[PDB]
Amino acid sequence: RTSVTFHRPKTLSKARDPKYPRISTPGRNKLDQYQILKYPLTTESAMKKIEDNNTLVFIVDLKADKKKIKAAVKKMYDIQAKKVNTLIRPDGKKKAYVKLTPDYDALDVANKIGII
Amino acid sequence: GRVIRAQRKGAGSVFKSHTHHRKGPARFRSLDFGERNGYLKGVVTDVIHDPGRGAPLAKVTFRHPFRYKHQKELFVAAEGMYTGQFVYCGRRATLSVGNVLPLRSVPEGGVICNVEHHVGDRGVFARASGDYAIVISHNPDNGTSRIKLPSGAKKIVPSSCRAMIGQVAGGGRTEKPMLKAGNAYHKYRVKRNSWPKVRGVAMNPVEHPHGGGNHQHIGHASTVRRDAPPGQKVGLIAARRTGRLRGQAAA
Amino acid sequence: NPLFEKRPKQFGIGGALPPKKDLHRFVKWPKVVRIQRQRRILKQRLKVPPALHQFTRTLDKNLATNLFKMLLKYRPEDKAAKKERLLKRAQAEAEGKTVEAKKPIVVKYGLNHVTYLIEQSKAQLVVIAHDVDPIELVVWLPALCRKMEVPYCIVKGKSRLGSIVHKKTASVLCLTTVKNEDKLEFSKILEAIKANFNDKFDEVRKKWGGGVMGSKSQAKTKARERLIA
RNA sequence: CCGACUUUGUGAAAUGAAUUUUACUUAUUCCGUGGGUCGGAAGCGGGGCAUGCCCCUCCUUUUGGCUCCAAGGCCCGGUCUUACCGGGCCGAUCC
RNA sequence: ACAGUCGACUC
RNA sequence: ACGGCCUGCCAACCCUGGAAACGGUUCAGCCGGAGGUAGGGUCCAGUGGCCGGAAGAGCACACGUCGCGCGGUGUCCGGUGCGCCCCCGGCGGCCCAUGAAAAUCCGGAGGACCGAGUACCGUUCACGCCCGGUCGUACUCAUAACCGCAUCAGGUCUCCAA
RNA sequence: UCCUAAGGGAAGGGGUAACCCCGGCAGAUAGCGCGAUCACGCGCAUCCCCGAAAGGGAAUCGGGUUAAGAUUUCCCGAGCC
Ligand SMILES: [Mg+2]
Ligand SMILES: [Mg+2]
Ligand SMILES: [Mg+2]
Ligand SMILES: [Mg+2]
Ligand SMILES: [Mg+2]
Ligand SMILES: [Mg+2]
Ligand SMILES: [Mg+2]
Ligand SMILES: [Mg+2]
Ligand SMILES: [Mg+2]
Ligand SMILES: [Mg+2]
Ligand SMILES: [Mg+2]
Ligand SMILES: [Mg+2]
Ligand SMILES: [Mg+2]
Ligand SMILES: [Mg+2]
Ligand SMILES: [Mg+2]
Ligand SMILES: [Mg+2]
Ligand SMILES: [Mg+2]
């Protein structure tokens, strides 16, 4: 030997190869677009957001994150978000401010879904 | 009664050692081949004040004998050491104040400090500020030596026990009156929670064997036996005598 | 050429750093290795009683190899070959209905079976492994073979016995009968083995083994006796 | 605190018909390392006033520097076969 | 060592 | 804010040079043949000056238009201090007390191993492209949103301060 | 959020009738890491996690704005990691 300390040797391990899958059925997507985008909040304070700042205010599933919000806002409504802000409103649900890239018009989307 | 302060100190609750700013264990080097059978050259880098200990500590930066790195060891400064000094460790270290030699290499009469006791336990006697052990005599038929400790006792130690030649620095420190409860307090914060210390005679019986009474007095012999159960062994333990020490008994 | 040069490093006690040499003496082993080393060391230091010290006295290599040649000649039956012997008698039972087998002769093994053979005195040669753990399984076969007058040897390697029979250990073997074509070869080995153990038991039943102190302790011994003498 | 039994083995003498003393290392107990040099025998010098055959030594004292991942030497073995790769050892005393 | 300008404060 | 340039405090550092008839300097110290006074340089702080940011912003006035209009002018110049707040620099003092650790970052020692020049190996440089997730965020912070059975003279840690 | 301090919980081990109790006791230590895979070599020290919205700390400023939000979260501009 060289050193006065015996460190444990290197052995080799195999990856798990089950003879039966533990979970057969393929797991469905449960935070899908329709759960993740519940309904656009339509207060007058948000109606002002629709026309001043080119933003749509949605109420989103509480376990949402900004990446999923932008992805769903794209698949639904066939737009994109240049930036999303989120906050969990004190009553309990999460509220998301989805600002559209100024290619798309928030008025146009608000009348394609019926808000204003 | 209730459990008495002499008994409460063994719990560790608040009586642990206040060691947040202490610089680490102050001890010799791990005895190895080179320092069994030759000398190793190390250089002092700083004399650092160790909190809670009167003796300064000397950072000594050896070169590692068999790996490529420095070894910041940390000694108890012997009065005389200075930064930039070369201290040499081993058996063929020249008898110079600061070098550490086995006692097989300290001529009789020489003063030493930080004496090991089992060869390689890295220094146990003559360590506090300004104390030293004199190598009285040697016996080469058993490979042992004798030293006069600070206490006035005389201990046979293995002849291969190392020792730092000189005396520990910081000597004469306990000569200065502290003059202030403030000085006493700032002394004991950095050692341990053992001050202020209340007379037992001014306690109630439930917490001290001396307690209570319409006058303050002990009421029974203040000398207690060696075997007295914990909580009774307070006072003067197993005393051979008392009163002011006169004559031969004061030796 | 001219630049090629010698640079001696001075591997002193304060010289340059020593190289990658051997430190095998000092390596801090796992606790398993550590304990299995002080195991044999402590068996060396302690005084083995004669019943256990009749071991450590094994067959010598030459006679062991001569014996194991015959043992290999008489190996027990393979799993591969034991299906064929039961497969091909099917027809001899189905059509002829008559058995033409003669006795197949091979070595016997297994502690219970060999003690059965020995205690009926049907055992014509016994071969005991020296290193059976727990030792008590064979502390007594030497004495048993000795007081029933059966030739025995304490060979070395229970695994090497196991190979003979195709098991991982064997711990004991014995021969009851050999082919007529090798009686003389057999009886040349029996007399030697008898001479080694069934002639020396009655004086190695008294000798305590062990006590062979350490290397440094023996160096102390030779240092001390000289300064005494 | 103390005695006996127990873990608790090995062998030696002295007193008595068991007692205090001792020596061993392996149980045990304490200590130390990143289990880093142990034990023995060599060899390099130096003391020689029986050339003994024994002792004292292990190529660092030096000025707050640096020191690692070996140069080197021989022997294998492949390679262009008319130009280049893999190793055995010594350096680093042997058991 | 004189001349020009300035100066908020203290005694 | 941020980017560039300039300055360069009090300390520290470099070069020439050689000091007694001792000098230099502080409110105080202190410094000097281990190299002062002197001449000349470097670096460091900056919450310092100028420019970009930037007048288009903000304020202030002045008008005149019905309807987050629009138009115009200014957004200057010095001097002060035992002055108060925040910070920084560097001295001096006190200690039987010497007054935290680590993440993260930077720097250095050594130099194994590496490549072209009709072209290939790097480049901690400049500019360029993309992305930046989860949770808190309102309000009181008290002679009424906190605790004391209260919308209780009680108690409860701070920052700003004419 | 990240880091550690006082200090806390813990794998192996030791105790405990069991709940629970001990963390330096040193055990092939919990984590292996680094160049490398077109693989392998080298090192393994004192070796897990938690612990501060007053300690350490990647980076932001000005002007607007709402009935109630933002000083720097929104808006315009200019940046930075
Ligand atoms: Mg948020
Ligand atoms: Mg107190
Ligand atoms: Mg007192
Ligand atoms: Mg008192
Ligand atoms: Mg009282
Ligand atoms: Mg009492
Ligand atoms: Mg009393
Ligand atoms: Mg009285
Ligand atoms: Mg100058
Ligand atoms: Mg500035
Ligand atoms: Mg100071
Ligand atoms: Mg807010
Ligand atoms: Mg607020
Ligand atoms: Mg209540
Ligand atoms: Mg944490
Ligand atoms: Mg924090
Ligand atoms: Mg903080």
Side-chain angles (χ1 to χ4, degrees), chain C residues 77-227:
Chain C
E77 64 184 1
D78 294 331
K79 67 181 288 185
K82 185 175 175 66
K83 54 199 280 203
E84 183 66 28
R85 63 180 292 165
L86 299 199
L87 186 151
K88 64 183 181 293
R89 272 57 174 181
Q91 293 85 6
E93 292 179 353
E95 291 82 4
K97 279 203 177 179
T98 62
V99 178
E100 184 178 1
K102 61 159 182 171
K103 186 180 289 293
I105 190 166
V106 306
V107 65
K108 308 299 174 58
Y109 53 98
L111 184 58
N112 291 318
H113 187 33
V114 174
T115 290
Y116 180 56
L117 304 186
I118 286 174
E119 184 177 1
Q120 312 160 225
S121 66
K122 301 186 175 179
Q124 183 62 255
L125 170 51
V126 173
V127 189
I128 293 143
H130 69 280
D131 62 339
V132 174
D133 169 8
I135 193 67
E136 293 83 3
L137 297 175
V138 297
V139 175
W140 46 266
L141 283 72
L144 169 67
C145 295
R146 153 71 178 81
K147 185 266 289 182
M148 294 178 71
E149 299 159 300
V150 174
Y152 79 90
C153 66
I154 290 150
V155 73
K156 160 164 307 191
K158 59 177 171 180
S159 76
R160 185 175 176 87
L161 278 55
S163 70
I164 301 298
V165 298
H166 306 247
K167 311 293 183 171
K168 295 184 290 294
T169 63
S171 178
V172 65
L173 277 66
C174 65
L175 277 297
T176 60
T177 300
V178 175
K179 294 181 176 67
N180 62 9
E181 184 177 0
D182 304 87
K183 266 59 177 175
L184 73 164
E185 181 65 26
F186 197 18
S187 278
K188 293 187 286 184
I189 194 66
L190 279 71
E191 294 293 328
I193 296 170
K194 197 171 301 267
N196 296 115
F197 294 151
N198 294 95
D199 285 3
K200 299 289 94 176
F201 183 77
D202 291 332
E203 66 182 2
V204 300
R205 66 182 294 165
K206 184 64 69 178
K207 180 67 174 66
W208 292 272
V212 298
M213 295 296 172
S215 314
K216 311 188 185 189
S217 297
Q218 294 171 337
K220 179 266 290 180
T221 312
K222 315 207 208 93
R224 185 176 179 179
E225 58 208 294
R226 277 162 280 151
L227 294 174

Side-chain angles (χ1 to χ4, degrees), chain C residues 5-7 17 26 45-47 216-217 224:
Chain C
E5 75 204 305
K6 302 221 306 173
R7 282 82 58 84
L17 277 296
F26 311 106
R45 300 301 181 269
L46 294 177
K47 293 183 184 292
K216 311 188 185 189
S217 297
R224 185 176 179 179

Side-chain angles (χ1 to χ4, degrees), chain A residues 2-93:
Chain A
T2 80
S3 66
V4 288
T5 303
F6 175 92
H7 294 102
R8 185 180 66 189
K10 66 183 288 184
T11 74
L12 187 153
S13 309
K14 303 134 74 163
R16 276 189 173 176
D17 186 74
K19 291 187 168 304
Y20 63 89
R22 266 58 163 168
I23 301 299
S24 295
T25 187
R28 49 175 316 202
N29 188 359
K30 281 166 157 290
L31 277 296
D32 191 358
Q33 64 183 357
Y34 308 97
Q35 294 296 289
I36 194 66
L37 276 157
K38 314 275 196 182
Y39 62 90
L41 187 152
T42 65
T43 313
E44 182 65 26
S45 66
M47 263 181 195
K48 292 181 181 179
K49 275 290 264 197
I50 306 305
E51 202 77 44
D52 313 313
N53 193 0
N54 180 3
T55 299
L56 275 297
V57 184
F58 292 98
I59 302 300
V60 303
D61 188 358
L62 195 155
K63 296 183 289 294
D65 61 45
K66 289 178 183 175
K67 185 182 287 185
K68 303 167 156 297
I69 293 180
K70 296 183 290 294
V73 173
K74 186 180 289 293
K75 268 172 37 57
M76 293 177 70
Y77 308 113
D78 291 331
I79 61 171
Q80 65 182 357
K82 180 265 290 181
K83 179 176 56 189
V84 63
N85 290 316
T86 68
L87 62 83
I88 296 170
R89 188 178 66 247
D91 202 341
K93 311 181 190 307

Side-chain angles (χ1 to χ4, degrees), chain A residues 1 6 9, chain C residues 24-25 27-41:
Chain A
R1 299 292 180 90
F6 175 92
Chain C
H24 208 84
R25 197 181 172 273
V27 168
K28 183 179 183 178
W29 291 105
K31 187 179 289 293
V32 176
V33 172
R34 180 185 318 181
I35 302 170
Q36 70 185 17
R37 300 190 172 180
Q38 293 87 21
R39 190 141 46 92
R40 72 176 290 273
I41 293 180

